[PDB]
Amino acid sequence: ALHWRAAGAATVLLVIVLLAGSYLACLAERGAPGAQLITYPRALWWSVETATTVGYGDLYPVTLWGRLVAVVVMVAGITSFGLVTAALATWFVGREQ
Amino acid sequence: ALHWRAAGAATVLLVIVLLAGSYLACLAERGAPGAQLITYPRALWWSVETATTVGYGDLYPVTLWGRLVAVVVMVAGITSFGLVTAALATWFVGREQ
Amino acid sequence: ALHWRAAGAATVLLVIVLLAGSYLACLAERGAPGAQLITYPRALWWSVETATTVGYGDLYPVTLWGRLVAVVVMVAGITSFGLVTAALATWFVGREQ
Amino acid sequence: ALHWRAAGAATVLLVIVLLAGSYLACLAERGAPGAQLITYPRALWWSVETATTVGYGDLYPVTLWGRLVAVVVMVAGITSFGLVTAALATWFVGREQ
Numbered sequence: 001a002l003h004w005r006a007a008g009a010a011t012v013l014l015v016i017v018l019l020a021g022s023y024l025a026c027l028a029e030r031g032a033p034g035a036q037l038i039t040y041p042r043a044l045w046w047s048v049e050t051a052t053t054v055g056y057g058d059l060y061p062v063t064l065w066g067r068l069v070a071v072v073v074m075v076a077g078i079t080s081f082g083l084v085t086a087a088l089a090t091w092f093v094g095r096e097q
Numbered sequence: 098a099l100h101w102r103a104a105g106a107a108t109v110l111l112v113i114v115l116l117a118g119s120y121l122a123c124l125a126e127r128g129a130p131g132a133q134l135i136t137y138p139r140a141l142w143w144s145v146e147t148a149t150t151v152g153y154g155d156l157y158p159v160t161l162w163g164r165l166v167a168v169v170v171m172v173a174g175i176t177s178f179g180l181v182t183a184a185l186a187t188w189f190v191g192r193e194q
Numbered sequence: 195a196l197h198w199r200a201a202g203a204a205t206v207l208l209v210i211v212l213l214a215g216s217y218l219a220c221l222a223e224r225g226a227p228g229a230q231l232i233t234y235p236r237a238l239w240w241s242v243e244t245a246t247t248v249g250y251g252d253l254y255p256v257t258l259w260g261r262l263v264a265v266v267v268m269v270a271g272i273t274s275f276g277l278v279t280a281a282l283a284t285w286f287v288g289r290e291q
Numbered sequence: 292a293l294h295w296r297a298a299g300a301a302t303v304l305l306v307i308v309l310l311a312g313s314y315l316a317c318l319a320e321r322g323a324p325g326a327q328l329i330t331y332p333r334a335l336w337w338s339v340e341t342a343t344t345v346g347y348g349d350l351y352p353v354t355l356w357g358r359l360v361a362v363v364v365m366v367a368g369i370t371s372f373g374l375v376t377a378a379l380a381t382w383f384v385g386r387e388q
């Protein structure tokens with residue numbers, strides 16, 4: 001099908017928005033007052049939290065560019081998440097017939 | 098359509114909303130013990146991180162007014178998002194035929 | 195209707211819960227090494243951010259009771275809102291005709 | 292039913308989940324530069340704000356493992372919730388008849 005195969009495949013987009021932005025923000029925040037982001041595994045952690053729209057605060061991109069990227073990496077894991085929730089609704093109705 | 102173009106539109110809608118709170122927040126907070134909520138280009142990243150419902154904490158309006166606005170600015174990001182979810186939802190439904 | 199007036203009514207309940215936990219958590223966090231969670235108008239601002247599950251971190255309860263109210267409110271946030279997402283979901287179907 | 296019992300059921304299962312990661316977490320991050328993740332009862336309040344998607348910032352583990360775990364924990368919260376959303380949407384839709 002789709003709603004079942006598509007949702008399963010767009011999470012695999014999520015890794016992309018996570019691994020990408022990590023190794024992207026981090027070379028925008030490499031040289032500067034940038035928080036503990038100047039690190040790649042640091043960033044990888046950030047995006048992870050960010051992905052879940054958590055927002056601990058422990059870290060965050062300060063660089064104008066790192067900042068934008070963020071915006072991207074969070075949309076990623078909400079856009080990505082609303083999908084699961086949408087497959088979920090269609091699946092619940094599939095048997096409601 | 099609607100459930101597809103009405104969400105296309107509410108997204109484009111919200112963006113302006115973010116800008117609103119931004120220069121509404123920040124005239125509210127730009128004259129007091131307020132935090133970085135004084136400069137325009139900050140509130141931007143503020144309204145952004147606020148809408149997505151992350152809440153690092155790095156910045157956070159103090160004034161009562163800057164505060165309502167926020168309350169407004171959050172709801173925007175949630176409602177705006179809940180649409181895209183509903184849009185996704187039915188578009189999965191529209192493959193039940 | 196329902197999905198359209200049960201949501202329009204359940205926000206009222208969510209609004210009530212804020213006003214509830216606010217003047218509730220506050221006497222739980224009154225006396226004792228607790229953040230500004232002592233004032234009445236202080237918690238109110240935390241509810242808005244709590245209900246929507248923002249998590250600035252600027253304010254939060256630490257007393258086993260103070261904490262209980264929190265969890266009770268946030269579940270109200272996330273709840274009161276999944277409704278308006280599901281009001282929106284079905285309204286996007288009611289024009290499948 | 293299903294969409295009503297399945298979600299009733301995933302909530303109870305989710306509640307049990309948080310506990311798992313909590314004593315699973317607190318053991319990963321109980322003996323190092325770790326914050327307040329050493330105490331069992333703390334982690335409870337950690338997972339709980341965590342699985343909700345809040346992210347106050349007052350605490351946060353950093354042990355690679357306690358961390359990986361967390362990523363597991365958020366997913367629980369959102370997933371668990373996305374259910375309640377699909378069920379609410381279907382229950383509100385099954386009233387069109």
Ligand SMILES: CCCC[N+](CCCC)(CCCC)CCCC
Pocket residue numbers: 051052053077078081149150174175178245246247271272275342343344368369372
């Ligand atoms: C399970 C808590 C729900 C958290 N949400 C969605 C999680 C997405 C990772 C955050 C809104 C992000 C648009 C919904 C806000 C609840 C008011």
Ligand SMILES: *SCC1=CC(C)(C)N(O)C1(C)C
Pocket residue numbers: 119120121122123124125127135136137138
């Ligand atoms: S938000 C208040 C404000 C005044 C002015 C000097 C015009 N700005 O640039 C901002 C938007 C900060």
Ligand SMILES: *SCC1=CC(C)(C)N(O)C1(C)C
Pocket residue numbers: 313314317318321329330331332
């Ligand atoms: S979480 C590690 C831990 C060990 C023990 C003493 C059994 N605990 O009560 C906790 C959970 C704190």
Ligand SMILES: [K+]
Pocket residue numbers: 052053054149150151246247248343344345
């Ligand atoms: K959130």
Ligand SMILES: [K+]
Pocket residue numbers: 053054055150151152247248249344345346
């Ligand atoms: K959050």
